[PDB]
Design a protein around this ligand. Structure first.
Ligand SMILES: Nc1ncnc2c1nc(Br)n2[C@@H]1O[C@H](COP(=O)(O)OP(=O)(O)OC[C@H]2O[C@@H](O)[C@H](O)[C@@H]2O)[C@@H](O)[C@H]1O
Length: 171
């Protein structure tokens, strides 16, 4: 497991690839895929829906059951559930929905959950439906995470922008 290939090494522990996270997960068989979740684990568009659909909706049913007996998550919080056919585990992480005025500082809280895991396959938290700048999310990630994080960015134009921006700001 955890056979990541073709990543660009950004820091000693952060790696980035222009790849759909679902197909990376099928290729790599990671111990942990990260899901960019909301506090009720209602997997809408974005990564959550793609992950859910690849589990034939088993992730959404598992999430319903988790929520029924544990209640919703906190922004910046997380929960480990099954990774189903994609990974051993899925780490569901709630970044701030910046479009709704939730504290963007909670992005640091969200990425801090990655530190509980040796190696993760992850998307950029809050950078899509939740409206954070993807460059800011990559920055928080490289600043906050100390464990090995392999970031999947499916859109080639965004990936190119992220690498360029990371170079310039790394100085
Ligand atoms: N197949 C893919 N492989 C790789 N990267 C992907 C893929 N698809 C997308 Br899209 N991305 C990119 O991963 C980033 C995060 O976007 P996101 O919307 O999934 O996560 P949040 O902004 O935290 O919103 C959470 C809310 O969205 C609902 O899904 C969830 O239930 C919740 O209510 C963005 O850069 C986006 O371009």
């Amino acid at each position: 497991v955890n056979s990541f290939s073709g990543y660009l090494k950004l820091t000693d522990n952060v790696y980035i690839k222009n790849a759909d996270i679902v197909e990376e997960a099928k290729k790599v068989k990671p111990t942990v895929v990260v899901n960019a979740a909301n506090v009720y684990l209602k997997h809408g568009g974005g990564v959550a829906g793609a992950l859910n659909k690849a589990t034939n909706n088993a992730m959404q049913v598992e999430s319903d059951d988790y929520i029924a007996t544990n209640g919703p998550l906190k922004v910046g919080g997380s929960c480990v559930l099954s990774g189903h056919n994609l990974a051993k585990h899925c780490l569901h992480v709630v970044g701030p929905n910046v479009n709704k005025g939730e504290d963007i500082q909670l992005l640091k809280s969200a990425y801090e959950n990655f530190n509980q895991h040796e190696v993760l396959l992850a998307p950029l938290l809050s950078a899509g439906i939740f409206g954070a700048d993807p460059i800011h999310s990559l920055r928080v990630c490289v600043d906050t995470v100390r464990t090995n994080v392999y970031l999947a960015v499916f859109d080639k134009n965004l990936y190119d922008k992220l690498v360029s921006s990371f170079l310039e700001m790394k100085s």
